Ligand binder design. Sequence first.
Ligand SMILES: [Zn+2]
Ligand SMILES: [Zn+2]
Ligand SMILES: [Zn+2]
Ligand SMILES: [Zn+2]
Ligand SMILES: [Zn+2]
Ligand SMILES: [Zn+2]
Ligand SMILES: [Zn+2]
Ligand SMILES: [Zn+2]
Lengths: 113, 313, 578
Amino acid sequence: AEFDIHRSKLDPSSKPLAQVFVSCNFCGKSISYSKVTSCPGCRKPLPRCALCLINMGTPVSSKDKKLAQFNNWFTWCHNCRHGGHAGHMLSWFRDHAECPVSACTCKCMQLDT
Amino acid sequence: MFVARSIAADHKDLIHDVSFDFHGRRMATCSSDQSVKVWDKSESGDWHCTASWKTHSGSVWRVTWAHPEFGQVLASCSFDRTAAVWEEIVQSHWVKRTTLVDSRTSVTDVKFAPKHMGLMLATCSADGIVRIYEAPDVMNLSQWSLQHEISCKLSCSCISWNPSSSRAHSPMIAVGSDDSSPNAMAKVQIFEYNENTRKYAKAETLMTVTDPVHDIAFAPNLGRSFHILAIATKDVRIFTLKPVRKELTSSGGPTKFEIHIVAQFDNHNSQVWRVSWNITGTVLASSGDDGCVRLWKANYMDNWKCTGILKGN
Amino acid sequence: VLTGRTMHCHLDAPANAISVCRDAAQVVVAGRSIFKIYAIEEEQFVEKLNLRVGRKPSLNLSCADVVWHQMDENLLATAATNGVVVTWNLGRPSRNKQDQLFTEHKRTVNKVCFHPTEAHVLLSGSQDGFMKCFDLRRKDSVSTFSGQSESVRDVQFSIRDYFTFASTFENGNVQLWDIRRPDRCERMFTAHNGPVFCCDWHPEDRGWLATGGRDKMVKVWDMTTHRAKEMHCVQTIASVARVKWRPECRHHLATCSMMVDHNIYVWDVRRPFVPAAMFEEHRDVTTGIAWRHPHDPSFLLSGSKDSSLCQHLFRDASQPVERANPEGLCYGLFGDLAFAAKESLVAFAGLASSALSVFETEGMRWFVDTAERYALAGRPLAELCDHNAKVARELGRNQVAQTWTMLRIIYCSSRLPPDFFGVLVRDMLHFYAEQGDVQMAVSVLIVLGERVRKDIDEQTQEHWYTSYIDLLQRFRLWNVSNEVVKLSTSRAVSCLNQASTTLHVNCSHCKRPMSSRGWVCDRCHRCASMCAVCHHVVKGLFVWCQGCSHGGHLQHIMKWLEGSSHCPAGCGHLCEYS
Ligand SMILES: [Zn+2]
Ligand SMILES: [Zn+2]
Ligand SMILES: [Zn+2]
Ligand SMILES: [Zn+2]
Ligand SMILES: [Zn+2]
Ligand SMILES: [Zn+2]
Ligand SMILES: [Zn+2]
Ligand SMILES: [Zn+2]
């Protein structure tokens, strides 16, 4: 990872790795980069954490404050497609072993190891 | 016994209202210096002010929080015949989202509705009018609509929603007055919403209350099958409302109730100013003109007795 | 002193200006179409003689400002809307008491003023941006002061000085001038943001001038020093129209507004946040206010646009401060009690401050502890009952433990009838729910399951479930809340958790949406879910950043971000700024 950072800094030609991105249910556009919890395009609400029942979202644009803590990022199970906040689901799967959504049987955290 | 802790507020005038948030970690104080301040506590337990911005042009009477599901939202009523709805946006900046100016007289009080009813607001003015505003889009706080308005024939001074979340109780709002006319008229009127007619109608009236009323409060239901109301006057009164079984005729009128008074205390020996319930609706706190706070609770035989007396400083 | 009572009378036309004589016996009222003098008696007032003589209307008749000479009781001055100034001499035997007319101005004359001692000098400020002085000696009286600013609003002589006056302009500037040096002004300063509408010297102080404009603020200026100093500032609820110092009181001023509001206020500068007294008699916008006698602080006079003029007594005013609520009280989730009270009730004026205190308990921890260690599923009924009973006995709630044990005996088994205890169980549930202990009722309902589900109507079950969930969310116990929701026996509560919790993901290379049970792109044939750190395919939990569209395994990303502040894919984005 350190070598990759160094190479990307020195060589602009290299394109970083390609991965997945989240899309709005209604507009269908990407939500990557006016309330935070709204789609930038359609202004409709975003999906909500399965534990806190609050719509997810993150502000978008050194011994200072942190705008977007790690505990508020999007997390989801790549098989059951259920997800929420990082901290909530981390705790829930630390104490349990089933998808937190009702009527879901995926053992989401046991799939990866 | 409780332990006291003083806080340096640095308000240039009288502090009128203090209210906690939903999670019991943040506090909001509105004063007569046209100012509202927000306090947050830390790990050490000390309270620090995190915001202080001028809001209105006249005195600020009441400030209340909204449910966190809609975000960090505050509502304030002022003496300049306005109500304001503010939001917090990320540092921490408080931005005026909406202003309601439909009233032509001083706005006496403002309060949010229970969560299960949506995002609704109720404001009572000094001319005797209670207005209910609703935001159809929870994602756009800048737009509000006027749903209902009620005239009470007397100057209003305080309102309270019924916090019951059951599906067997229609929404209820109680309105009190602080008129001092020599005529011994009613001071507390309770309206109920009728689904069929889609209109609030007068449901009950407390004829035994004739003194000016300074505050009223419903108690949190939390599973009971009747309602408890607390009224502050020259003394402290507690009433119970038990709905009667609906007749098989299926009348479309307001539900009938049986009204009883279960406690009347006058230990303050003065005008009782404020009343408030605890979280579970089991302990009542009353503050009067003696400069002391009193706590009240009922035993298993339904006898209300004082349990604690607190004194400033 | 003067005696009387509060009394109102109705005019025939809207009133725009009022003035008082020195004897406090007659008041002149003028407007667009009204011009009359009234004698006020202890019972009521009566018109004496109207100045609307002659059926022919004149542009000079539409007067906006009328002043009664403070030197002679027979001299009146009016400023018309046609840019003319008219003098009226009651001593003239003619019905039309018009004496002299001066058409020096071309725009509307806004304000006119007399001299306190000289009975032959008048000042006029108009919309032309100039100020004109007039000598009643009929000599060459032309004397124009050009303020080089917007239209002039108010002009006033000083009471102590003989040659000094002040002017306010619609640009927001105040100029202090002298009459002996028309060449240039003496002082100039910006008093308000926006036009200034009124000004007044302090009747007793020799260097205090109060100003007021549309900025809804009235500020007192000190003029003794070379640089003017602001002393006090008061905020009203509307644009301040007119201000008058109260006689015999050093720190009291009456104010009337121009729009929106109709009430007249009396403020004390020492407490600039609440009015000292209020008058709400009028129904239309107040237009003219004047203290009756220069040495009597008892009576006030006010005429409004509703063709009504009333005399008010100070003792009859409303006092908001005397009826204000002086305390605030609130409860907290942790048993804390916030209490703010007036300083006087706890221990210039000690009644303008308050003390704020919080009372704490050395309060409901049993709730949290019980909610965290109860067992609700995964084991047979007897084991659950025993475990819950032991937990309850640990915290000292003996009756709950006995209830759990009795439940185990009743259900977990020449016999009793099969449903001998149903009524008792239902009544126990109701009893525990009727005193705010929803936790026990909900726990029992979940544990028992179908053995008691059909004896309770759905509405009560939903009520209990919602109350318990709300309390859990208040205390911020998400795991227990979700556990209750999953195991709920009510359809609505069970379905509460499935509302819009499904995410849609697309490959960033082909931009196409992916299936719900695979990790390979259908068109790209690429592993779109390769962790940015370990470079392996991710099957289960995936954490994603909204900024750089990168992510990976939950624990990998967490550990990496604990050590640095760069996107591990090497994009440059600081995904967790600082
Ligand atoms: Zn969208
Ligand atoms: Zn799932
Ligand atoms: Zn899954
Ligand atoms: Zn969450
Ligand atoms: Zn692809
Ligand atoms: Zn990995
Ligand atoms: Zn990145
Ligand atoms: Zn990023």
